[PDB]
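Rotation project, supervised by the postdoc (A.L.). Task for the rotation student: set up a whole-complex structure prediction and record inputs and outputs verbatim in this book. Inputs entered:
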Amino acid sequence: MFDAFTKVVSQADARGAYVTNDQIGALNQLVSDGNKRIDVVNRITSNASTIVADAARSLFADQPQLIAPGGNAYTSRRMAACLRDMEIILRYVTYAIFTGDGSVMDDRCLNGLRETYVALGVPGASVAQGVSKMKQAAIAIANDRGGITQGDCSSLMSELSGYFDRAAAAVG
Amino acid sequence: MFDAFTKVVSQADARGAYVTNDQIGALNQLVSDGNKRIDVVNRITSNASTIVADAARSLFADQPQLIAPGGNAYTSRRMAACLRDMEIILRYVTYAIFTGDGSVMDDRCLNGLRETYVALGVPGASVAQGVSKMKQAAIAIANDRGGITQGDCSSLMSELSGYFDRAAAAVG
Amino acid sequence: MFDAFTKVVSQADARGAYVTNDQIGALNQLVSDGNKRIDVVNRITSNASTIVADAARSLFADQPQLIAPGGNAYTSRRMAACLRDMEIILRYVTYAIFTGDGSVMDDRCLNGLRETYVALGVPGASVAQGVSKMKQAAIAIANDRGGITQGDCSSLMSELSGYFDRAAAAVG
Amino acid sequence: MKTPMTEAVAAADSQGRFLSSSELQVAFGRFRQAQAGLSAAQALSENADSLVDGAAQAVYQKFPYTTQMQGDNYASTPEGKAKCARDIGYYLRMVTYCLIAGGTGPMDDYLIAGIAEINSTFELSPSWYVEALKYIKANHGLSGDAAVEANSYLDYAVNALS
Amino acid sequence: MKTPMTEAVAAADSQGRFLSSSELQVAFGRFRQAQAGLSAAQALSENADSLVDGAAQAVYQKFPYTTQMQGDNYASTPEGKAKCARDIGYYLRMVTYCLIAGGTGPMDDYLIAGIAEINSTFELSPSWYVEALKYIKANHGLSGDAAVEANSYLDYAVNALS
Amino acid sequence: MKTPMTEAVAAADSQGRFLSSSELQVAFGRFRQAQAGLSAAQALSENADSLVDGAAQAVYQKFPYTTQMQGDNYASTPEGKAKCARDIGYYLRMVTYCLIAGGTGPMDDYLIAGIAEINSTFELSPSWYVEALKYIKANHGLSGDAAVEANSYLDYAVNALS
Ligand SMILES: *[C@@H](C)[C@H]1/C(=C/c2[nH]c(/C=C3N=C(/C=C4\NC(=O)C(CC)=C4C)C(C)=C\3CCC(=O)O)c(CCC(=O)O)c2C)NC(=O)[C@@H]1C
Ligand SMILES: *[C@@H](C)[C@H]1/C(=C/c2[nH]c(/C=C3N=C(/C=C4\NC(=O)C(CC)=C4C)C(C)=C\3CCC(=O)O)c(CCC(=O)O)c2C)NC(=O)[C@@H]1C
Ligand SMILES: *[C@@H](C)[C@H]1/C(=C/c2[nH]c(/C=C3N=C(/C=C4\NC(=O)C(CC)=C4C)C(C)=C\3CCC(=O)O)c(CCC(=O)O)c2C)NC(=O)[C@@H]1C
Ligand SMILES: *[C@H](C)[C@H]1/C(=C/c2[nH]c(/C=C3N=C(/C=C4\NC(=O)C(CC)=C4C)C(C)=C\3CCC(=O)O)c(CCC(=O)O)c2C)NC(=O)[C@@H]1C
Ligand SMILES: *[C@H](C)[C@H]1/C(=C/c2[nH]c(/C=C3N=C(/C=C4\NC(=O)C(CC)=C4C)C(C)=C\3CCC(=O)O)c(CCC(=O)O)c2C)NC(=O)[C@@H]1C
Ligand SMILES: *[C@H](C)[C@H]1/C(=C/c2[nH]c(/C=C3N=C(/C=C4\NC(=O)C(CC)=C4C)C(C)=C\3CCC(=O)O)c(CCC(=O)O)c2C)NC(=O)[C@@H]1C
Ligand SMILES: *[C@H](C)[C@H]1/C(=C/c2[nH]c(/C=C3N=C(/C=C4\NC(=O)C(CC)=C4C)C(C)=C\3CCC(=O)O)c(CCC(=O)O)c2C)NC(=O)[C@@H]1C
Ligand SMILES: *[C@H](C)[C@H]1/C(=C/c2[nH]c(/C=C3N=C(/C=C4\NC(=O)C(CC)=C4C)C(C)=C\3CCC(=O)O)c(CCC(=O)O)c2C)NC(=O)[C@@H]1C
Ligand SMILES: *[C@H](C)[C@H]1/C(=C/c2[nH]c(/C=C3N=C(/C=C4\NC(=O)C(CC)=C4C)C(C)=C\3CCC(=O)O)c(CCC(=O)O)c2C)NC(=O)[C@@H]1C
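Outputs recorded:
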């Protein structure tokens, strides 16, 4: 599994290179943003159930065919599996923003997920829409100015958005 | 696994529908034919060994290449495996005529069987011929007028023929 | 698994044939070369570590990209796996020259190896080059005139070369 | 999905054998009683609109806050009332399917497996649905064995929610 | 398919290792005795027609009903006699293969595995084939070690049928 | 590849759950100390040529036969000296990676797993590399915590070779 630091190391080893001053500088900036990163992990994790529920509600409002009789999220078992998948993907996004690398989410969640969904008949475009709705909610919660020392978290919000976008692309 | 009743239920649930009066009427007719259906199960099961042996004998007479040295049913192990497959398929046909639905035979016997036979080099056209020879014998035994209360079993013989034909199609 | 004798038997059974006088004659010649065959097994086995090491050294000299940082044999774990594969293939070649048939090496080593190497990104042309370097060394050692009763082992060297060539073809 | 008939086959299949005398008795019993369940299912189906609408109003009477409090989980809007009547119709349809199937299989597969996760996630009270089911039990107008068979599935659902 | 030679390799392979000194001794022993089996196989092969035809007539003499009773399992037709002589030739050919292989492997793989199912399904009596095998043992005309090696496989087949 | 950060995730993942309060503390600690390792890595990197060349000459001084004896395993040719300096540079680069990673993961994955097989196959003495590592420890010029962190990885490599 990589974190931000071992990702840099792995790319350097493949080139037989020492990590450069520019790369060291970038990792130092990540380190100096560490409190903010943990606030992102904490805020998303603390609000995970409402992020999933609210995104799911919004998905089914926009994609009513999923919950019509015969639809892929109709029956309690299929609805429960769909809500589980939304939570699974959010959980792996939190791991990625914690480590500062997307490898955990590629290796353990997304690799082969496209093919799994084909075999099951799960519509990946709707999974992607659910993921993007969780993204919107998670950024609003993580980047909320209330009850925190004021400062800029824009780099972390871009990185977080990237992990959600990576999951959305992987399922379709 | 479906039976005739849960097959109707499953198709209705996918449409969000109550089972219709016409469907209820059809299931009532199946119920009122229930003794005849159990006679079919009992007659085929009671005569399974001779249905298999006689169909196999007839297959090898019509397809001598199967039992020539080098053929797919040559050697005792391959002959025994072939006789086993004939019995397996007859067993799943009896399950289908018992339940009144072919799902048991699709899910547990036929799905992927085409591909299994390709990987082994088993000639599915000859399996299909064996199956159709078991069909002829099983109908003659099941629909024999001797030693039974006289009446019409034509609907059951059509349904039974359909399960044998489904297996024959699936192996090729 | 076949040996030279059961390979002949298996090909005869597929034709419903008795083993012919010509085939018996060929097996008798194999039997009368039996001491020489065991010398080949013994000489390659006794020198296996130097056959592997010397072939590997020669491979990396000819294919420097394998050991450059980022190359497929760079890092201790990948180098160790590569040396392991060279030893594995030599071990199966010794089994083939011991039994007088290549089936052990097809069934347990080579079948699916092409596909395994694709999935891993192992360059089969370089594996094949390593195998051919082990071939050269193994023939020089097995066919060395020192310290043995003098005589002709040319048939065994052709057969041995064939097993190495079969492995080389299988990996690419 | 399972029923006594498919469990008889599953038992035979698990042992690599043809159906036994005991498994043929499962079929005799099933066909002896199947018509009762078909008739009860048809009777409920014919009264579905009255039973569902009456059950929804019974819930709103017992839990008046459900039609007054604002929230996505409540029946205080036309949309919420429609979701509620839809869900109650799902329960009634599942009861009819169990009657046709001769067991709980349809309700197990389509409604009960996952229901606790649904109700937790969407903040739906199981007690609301229990009252709907008890209204149906009290108002289907079935007699004797038909009533017991329908009530068995209504009570099975109540139990799963309780 | 296995033989002492392939079992020596299978043992080495199961332990991820090169062949041992003890496994090289298997090859010395095999090559020391292999010619005996080759010669015995060739001697039987050359007399196959006489041995098979004589064995079939020996069976018909011991079991006269097999050429008189009507049935698909019997030698009361030309077709049945041909099936019987064919089967006896299979047994003799398997004995020659065992002699060439240095073990029972060919007969195990091609004839014995499944023989009980064949004979049950097609209503063939194992006792018929035992008499054929005992005729071959009595009439192959081999001496000494050649006789013992051939008889070992004929007796192995009798045992499998007994 | 693992580090304390990825082991925190692996623990959460193995239990199907979001990160715990204890796992967030791993991140606080990592970010509190990460700069120390980044700075030490950068200091070593900047002195890599001197450290590697000096380490190679330290090995040749302690083991004079390595530059005199003929053999593919020795530094008695320009090619052998180049292989040796290359290998020593690999060790130093791995130490810098461990400092950046906050653990042994890079050295484990890229150098230690398989090193005994390499050194056996190519007849390279582990003791040669131990002397190179001890030269680096003695000559990197780091102080205090930076020295301890670098030395921890140099000593870990010595231990793996010892
Ligand atoms: C973007 C995410 C928003 C933001 C972040 C922000 N955070 C800090 C400072 C800290 N964050 C923490 C985190 C925690 N303290 C706890 O008790 C827990 C629970 C265990 C957590 C996760 C800490 C310790 C600090 C430092 C002390 C403090 O509270 O200030 C800052 C300040 C700068 C810095 O990086 O330290 C900022 C900017 N602030 C915003 O306005 C964004 C919307
Ligand atoms: C088509 C299949 C043939 C046919 C069927 C037929 N069966 C019945 C009646 C019954 N069948 C049974 C079955 C069994 N009784 C047993 O003891 C067992 C073994 C455990 C079995 C399987 C039973 C109980 C009955 C009812 C009593 C009876 O024997 O009559 C009928 C009559 C109509 C009905 O459905 O009951 C018929 C028509 N008859 C034919 O002529 C077809 C060739
Ligand atoms: C080609 C491979 C070379 C070659 C072979 C050769 N070998 C022999 C004879 C024998 N080989 C052995 C083998 C062994 N004896 C042992 O102690 C061991 C270790 C356990 C082994 C593997 C034996 C027993 C003999 C017979 C006695 C003897 O040493 O002569 C011959 C002679 C002919 C024959 O087949 O017996 C030959 C030709 N000779 C060459 O010149 C090739 C380069
Ligand atoms: C919800 C937005 C959508 C939806 C989802 C849905 N998914 C399944 C089934 C599965 N999903 C997974 C995924 C994973 N399992 C894991 O352990 C991980 C992490 C490594 C992932 C990403 C798997 C494996 C399954 C199959 C097994 C299971 O059911 O748990 C279903 C059920 C499909 C079925 O027919 O049974 C559904 C409904 N469906 C929608 O309509 C939404 C778009
Ligand atoms: C007989 C009419 C034909 C024939 C058949 C034949 N089949 C096999 C081998 C297999 N058949 C199966 C099938 C199943 N196994 C199951 O458990 C089920 C139920 C779920 C089925 C349908 C399988 C899996 C095998 C492979 C494993 C095994 O041997 O048991 C063979 C043997 C092939 C071989 O070379 O070993 C044969 C001969 N062959 C004919 O020529 C007839 C047309
Ligand atoms: C060396 C000449 C080349 C080389 C090889 C290399 N191979 C692997 C990995 C594997 N090789 C095998 C092969 C087998 N395993 C067996 O048990 C058998 C006998 C049945 C064989 C033939 C397998 C299965 C693997 C994968 C599992 C493992 O690593 O042991 C690697 C490692 C690849 C990686 O990225 O991890 C390498 C490097 N590489 C070269 O560059 C040479 C051309
Ligand atoms: C009625 C008693 C009360 C009520 C109902 C209400 N329900 C929902 C939403 C959902 N209900 C279900 C139920 C099922 N789906 C299935 O597939 C099955 C099995 C066949 C069942 C039983 C589900 C999954 C949902 C959520 C997804 C969807 O909208 O379909 C709502 C809306 C909740 C929301 O947040 O949107 C409401 C209002 N509420 C009351 O107050 C009534 C007393
Ligand atoms: C001869 C002693 C008596 C006899 C023989 C007889 N055999 C058959 C049919 C079969 N015999 C075999 C045997 C084998 N098949 C193999 O692959 C092997 C291993 C290589 C063996 C030993 C088989 C499988 C059959 C059935 C299929 C086929 O026809 O090949 C018959 C015909 C039986 C029938 O019902 O058609 C007969 C007559 N019968 C006697 O009365 C003799 C004394
Ligand atoms: C220097 C202290 C002494 C020395 C070195 C020497 N090394 C080699 C050959 C190899 N060294 C390695 C080492 C690594 N490869 C890796 O991927 C890693 C991890 C990143 C390590 C540490 C390997 C694998 C080889 C062999 C393959 C190759 O050539 O790269 C040689 C040459 C040996 C040969 O037989 O060609 C030498 C000379 N020798 C001394 O005498 C120095 C004191």
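Student's summary: Residues C 35-36, 38-40, 42, 142-143, 145, 148-151, 153, 156; E 24 surround phycocyanobilin (ligand 3) (CB under 6 Å).
Supervisor addendum: Residues 1-32 of chain C form one domain.
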